[PDB]
Design a protein around this nucleic acid. Structure first.
Length: 255
DNA sequence: CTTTTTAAAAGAAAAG
DNA sequence: CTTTTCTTTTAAAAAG
């Protein structure tokens, strides 16, 4: 009953996440950057209708908010299969080039997995849902990520922007990985015996026994839920001696 | 949609 | 004429 025991840790039961211990992020620009406002390419009604429900949901969640900004980047509808289920994709390349580079601290998967000893053969794999959206953006940095949104001829006058760390932003993966490492530093200290690998939003908990893995998992879920992160109950792989993690199949200490 | 770069195919230029 | 190899421009494929 892992689901019922931890209502707050699961995206299915605890609502959209919010990393409450992390200060809103300020995104430093390069020394010479100036705002760039790129025109929105005309979108078909079919693409707009497909994207609308996603935008409205983000506005209701407060992840998107109206704004007037000197910055603007294009929104691109990306049809997964076909004329159905669209998803908004922002082209942030002109913003990415104006933001100051940070050192990439996310380890490559091969090196991260080198830290998995054979003694720990019981695994748990959690996938954090909408991880980036759990981190707030400082209000000074929100205008950077603005885009245009039009109910064809009326309604939201023009631009929207993000109040949370956005997809397509070049530093999101690193900033998220660093924030979650800060938030789980204690957990690691209270559980010296457990192994925890973090790859941005993909976590792997490794234990020596099935009980340890069960007690460790309970504690990890409890901590993540309290911190404001949410895991995907659907994808979770709990206390198994065989799991899929970062494209590998973990078993017998192999791969 | 637009920019990036990666790759493969086509078109000049040496050469005997 | 034919083979060689060098340039260059046309096309796919990642990407936000």
């Amino acid at each position: 009953t892992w689901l019922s025991d931890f209502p707050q840790a699961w995206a299915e039961t605890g609502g959209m996440g919010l990393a409450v211990r992390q200060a809103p992020l300020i995104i430093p620009l390069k020394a010479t950057s100036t705002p760039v406002s790129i025109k929105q390419y005309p979108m078909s009604q079919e693409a707009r209708l497909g994207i609308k429900p996603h935008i409205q949901r983000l506005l209701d969640q407060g992840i998107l908010v109206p704004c007037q900004s000197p910055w603007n980047t294009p929104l691109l509808p990306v049809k997964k299969p076909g004329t159905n289920d669209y998803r908004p994709v922002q082209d942030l390349r002109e913003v990415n080039k104006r933001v100051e580079d940070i050192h990439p601290t996310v380890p490559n998967p091969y090196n991260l997995l080198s830290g998995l000893p054979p003694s720990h053969q019981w695994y748990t794999v959690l996938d954090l849902k909408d991880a980036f959206f759990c981190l707030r953006l400082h209000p000074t940095s929100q205008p950077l990520f603005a885009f245009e949104w039009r109910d064809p001829e009326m309604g939201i006058s023009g631009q929207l922007t993000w109040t949370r760390l956005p997809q397509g932003f070049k530093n999101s993966p690193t900033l998220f990985d660093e924030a979650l490492h800060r938030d789980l530093a204690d957990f690691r200290i209270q559980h010296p015996d457990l192994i925890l690998l973090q790859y941005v939003d993909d976590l792997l908990l490794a234990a020596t026994s099935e009980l340890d893995c069960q007690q460790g998992t309970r504690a990890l879920l409890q901590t993540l839920g309290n911190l404001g992160y949410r895991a995907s109950a659907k994808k979770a792989q709990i206390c198994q001696k065989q799991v899929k993690y970062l494209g590998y199949l973990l078993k017998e200490g192999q791969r």
